[PDB]
Design a binder for this molecule. Structure first.
Ligand SMILES: CCCCCCCCO[C@@H]1O[C@H](CO)[C@@H](O)[C@H](O)[C@H]1O
Ligand SMILES: CCCCCCCCO[C@@H]1O[C@H](CO)[C@@H](O)[C@H](O)[C@H]1O
Ligand SMILES: CCCCCCCCO[C@@H]1O[C@H](CO)[C@@H](O)[C@H](O)[C@H]1O
Ligand SMILES: CCCCCCCCO[C@@H]1O[C@H](CO)[C@@H](O)[C@H](O)[C@H]1O
Ligand SMILES: CCCCCCCCO[C@@H]1O[C@H](CO)[C@@H](O)[C@H](O)[C@H]1O
Ligand SMILES: CCCCCCCCO[C@@H]1O[C@H](CO)[C@@H](O)[C@H](O)[C@H]1O
Ligand SMILES: CCCCCCCCCCCCC
Ligand SMILES: CCCCCCCCCCCCC
Ligand SMILES: [Zn+2]
Ligand SMILES: [Zn+2]
Length: 274
């Protein structure tokens, strides 16, 4: 019924594309007006941190279109289709791996590629849990809330916005750059080519996976990974940080089991309970 309320069990697929009534939603929760560009609305807010984090993770839906972040001529940068990630980055994967395969034992290059993929899944778990869901640990700053929003908050705010799910290359480059330098500073040159190629390939698998978890009836073997990730959205976002798998969830005890609690809804009509 109301999308802002977490559920113990996921509802129907088509209840997740029900457009939010903008006026009602603003008046009811006193948060963001979906009808107006969201970013300045955050930059110039009187939110305190606990309210922002409580509210941004209670999902809404703009409808068939995409909510405005800027509303001006910068708006194209905020829209990135699923196919953008493979076309942008798979050529980089193939170039770095191809280099390694001409200057190094190919069998060890393949092996170092695979450990790149393995390290990616750990990064995937770590970024998601500790950077993306900084949440409670956030300052009392609007610039912090806007940064959070841009990195992951928006996606929790609007799960079914098909153009605000995968990472825009502009942001990806900023995050990837320190990893690229670190790998090429530690590892022997052509080991870095093979290793980085793998980590990068793992990233592409992640975001594509992440996309199709939201916007697709998947083949059966992935169908339960879909339930798992969607529960991270509509049940508990303190758990279920793995999205290509719950491997690292199990390892670090953040698995999202079938009697996991709901997440707290601290605020209502602008005010906190108790
Ligand atoms: C100012 C440069 C344009 C910013 C576009 C804002 C759209 C934010 O896009 C976000 O990218 C994050 C990772 O980068 C992803 O984790 C989120 O799922 C996605 O919402
Ligand atoms: C990796 C190369 C991919 C080739 C392009 C795939 C065809 C794109 O297909 C697009 O999919 C969109 C899904 O959001 C639809 O909204 C568009 O109508 C459709 O044209
Ligand atoms: C590495 C890339 C793996 C992903 C390829 C999956 C291709 C899915 O196929 C696409 O699904 C889209 C759903 O958004 C539809 O809009 C497109 O019409 C369809 O071509
Ligand atoms: C590698 C190039 C693949 C191009 C993918 C085609 C998708 C973009 O083309 C169009 O973009 C429009 C945006 O308004 C969408 O509304 C359409 O559904 C889509 O087909
Ligand atoms: C980052 C891209 C690679 C992901 C690595 C982890 C993928 C694990 O994937 C899982 O493997 C299981 C095997 O027991 C299968 O049962 C599941 O269907 C599959 O989702
Ligand atoms: C790492 C890659 C993860 C994505 C793989 C699963 C994507 C499944 O995507 C599938 O694409 C099909 C072809 O158009 C569509 O018919 C299906 O509706 C869609 O589920
Ligand atoms: C492909 C991921 C982004 C790569 C960023 C490269 C950072 C610069 C590398 C060379 C260092 C110049 C000072
Ligand atoms: C053996 C070292 C592997 C290093 C892999 C680095 C992965 C780069 C992708 C980083 C993505 C940041 C979001
Ligand atoms: Zn998601
Ligand atoms: Zn999340």
């Amino acid at each position: 019924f109301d999308s802002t309320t977490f559920v113990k069990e996921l509802p129907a697929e088509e209840k997740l594309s029900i457009a939010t009534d903008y006026s009602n939603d603003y008046k009811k929760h006193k948060f963001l007006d979906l009808n107006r560009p969201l970013l300045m609305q955050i930059l110039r807010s009187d939110f305190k941190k606990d309210f922002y984090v409580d509210q941004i993770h209670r999902p809404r839906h703009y409808g068939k279109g995409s909510a405005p972040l800027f509303g001006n001529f910068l708006e194209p940068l905020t829209k990135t289709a699923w196919w953008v990630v493979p076309v942008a980055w798979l050529p980089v994967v193939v170039y770095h791996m191809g280099v390694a395969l001409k200057n190094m034992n190919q069998l060890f290059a393949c092996f170092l590629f695979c450990v790149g993929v393995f390290v990616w899944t750990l990064i995937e778990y770590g970024l998601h849990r500790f950077l993306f869901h900084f949440d409670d640990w956030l300052p009392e700053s609007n610039i912090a809330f806007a940064t959070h929003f841009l990195l992951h908050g928006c996606h929790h705010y609007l799960p079914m916005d098909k153009y605000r799910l995968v990472m825009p290359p502009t942001l990806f480059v900023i995050l990837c750059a320190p990893f690229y330098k670190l790998v090429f500073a530690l590892l022997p040159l052509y080991w870095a080519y093979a290793g980085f190629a793998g980590g990068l390939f793992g990233y592409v698998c992640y975001d594509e996976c992440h996309f199709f978890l939201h916007h697709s009836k998947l083949p059966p073997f992935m169908r339960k990974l879909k339930k798992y990730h969607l529960e991270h959205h509509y049940k508990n976002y303190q758990l279920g940080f793995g999205v290509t798998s719950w491997f690292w969830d199990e390892v670090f005890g953040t698995y999202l089991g079938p009697d996991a609690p709901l997440s707290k809804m601290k605020y209502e009509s602008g005010l906190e309970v108790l």
